[PDB]
């Protein structure tokens, strides 16, 4: 980019003679209301922005100020990585070569290490009458332990 930039002030000035300066903060994982001023980046340090919030937004004047720092020799990036477990039928997997899909018809009743659509563990697989929802590939018990597949 042209230069690193970030918001230094994002406050709501309320009413009267703008004598109350309430700062508007963000919640974890969320965007700022002052990002709409210079979404592509602040041109210069200390730029001043104003906006008139409507009744659907709390009212008052939204003053935003941004700061600009010069670009480095090498672009430096920041990452925030989050993962989830057990919230999907499929999964995201890295390029790990587990081998090839195998069959359980020769191993019924024998404890076998398994990795089924990202869900891994050890257990004994027994042919059963279908219970639970078909599209929901996994049937879990009352303690979030797999009991069907």
């Amino acid at each position, epitope marked *: 980019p042209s230069s690193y930039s970030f918001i230094s002030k994002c406050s709501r000035l309320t009413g009267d003679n*703008s004598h109350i300066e309430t700062p508007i903060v963000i919640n974890p994982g969320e965007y700022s209301i002052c990002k709409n001023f210079a979404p592509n980046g602040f041109s210069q340090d200390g730029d001043y922005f104003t906006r008139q919030l409507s009744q659907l937004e709390g009212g008052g004047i939204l003053v935003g100020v941004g700061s600009v720092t010069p670009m480095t020799d090498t672009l430096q990036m920041g990452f925030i990585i989050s993962v989830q477990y057990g919230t999907d039928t499929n999964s995201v997997c890295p390029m790990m070569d587990l081998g090839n899909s195998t069959t359980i018809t020769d191993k019924l009743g024998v404890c076998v290490e398994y990795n089924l659509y990202g869900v891994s563990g050890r257990g004994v697989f027994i042919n059963c009458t279908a219970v639970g929802v078909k599209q929901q590939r996994f049937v879990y018990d009352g303690f979030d332990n797999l009991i069907g597949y």
Partner: antibody, heavy 131, light 105 residues
């Protein structure tokens, strides 16, 4: 267009405070970045006296004024005034009402740099300290 | 800082290449303006950057420069241009220049 006429006395005694009143006649106080005062002693160059933000009560002053200067705004009457305390014969000058404009006021957004060149000035009121 | 203007009293003739010059103690980030003050008049802005001409200014004006040296260049020396030319800087603090002075011959 905004025209800035200002009013006040012309003769101030030593140690007696100096009050000026500059009223804006185009738009309003809240249609600008900040409003500033500029003085100029007779034949001695201009000088920056201070400024007041249009939104908020934040103000800045010349450090060479020893915190003797208070510049306030009153949106009700559409004016912003100046008070300089402990006036001296060395302080006699002509005081210029000024304005620092936004670069654009589009939609509902006004964008101005942190420091901009004064754009529209008043005529100026000539004060003197004497007896 | 301490600004300066070199040509002091640069009297001129109708039709020239009038070139002013305003130097700063330290570099300014192009935050230099030019103001023109007739005898007994509020100062009137001319340029609000290195060469960003302001509204209503005749095209004959074109300043130049950045950092520590600047200039204001006028060719058509018209009688409605005789006066005083300050230079203003807002990069550090807010200060005005010494002030030049021009006249016809």
């Amino acid at each position: 267009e905004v025209q800035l006429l200002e009013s006040g006395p012309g003769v101030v005694r030593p140690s007696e405070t100096l009050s000026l009143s500059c009223a804006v006649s185009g738009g309003s106080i809240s249609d600008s970045y900040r409003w500033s005062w500029i003085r100029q002693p007779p034949g001695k160059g201009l000088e920056w006296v201070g400024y007041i933000f249009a939104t908020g009560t934040t103000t800045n002053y010349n450090p060479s004024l020893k915190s003797r200067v208070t510049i306030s705004k009153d949106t009700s009457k559409n004016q912003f005034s100046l008070k300089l305390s402990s006036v001296t014969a060395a302080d006699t000058a002509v005081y210029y009402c000024a304005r620092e404009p936004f670069k654009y006021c589009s939609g509902g957004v006004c964008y101005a740099h942190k420091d901009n060149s004064l754009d529209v000035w008043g005529q100026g009121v000539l004060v003197t300290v004497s007896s | 800082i301490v600004m300066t203007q070199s040509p002091a009293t640069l009297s001129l003739s109708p039709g020239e290449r009038a070139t002013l010059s305003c130097r700063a103690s330290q570099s300014v980030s192009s935050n230099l303006a030019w103001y023109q003050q007739k005898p007994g008049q509020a100062p009137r802005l001319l340029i609000h950057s290195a060469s960003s001409r302001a509204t209503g200014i005749p095209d004959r004006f074109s300043g130049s420069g950045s950092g520590t040296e600047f200039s204001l260049t006028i060719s058509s020396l018209e009688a409605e241009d005789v006066g005083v030319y300050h230079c203003y800087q807002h990069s550090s603090g807010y200060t005005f220049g010494p002030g030049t002075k021009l006249d016809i011959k």
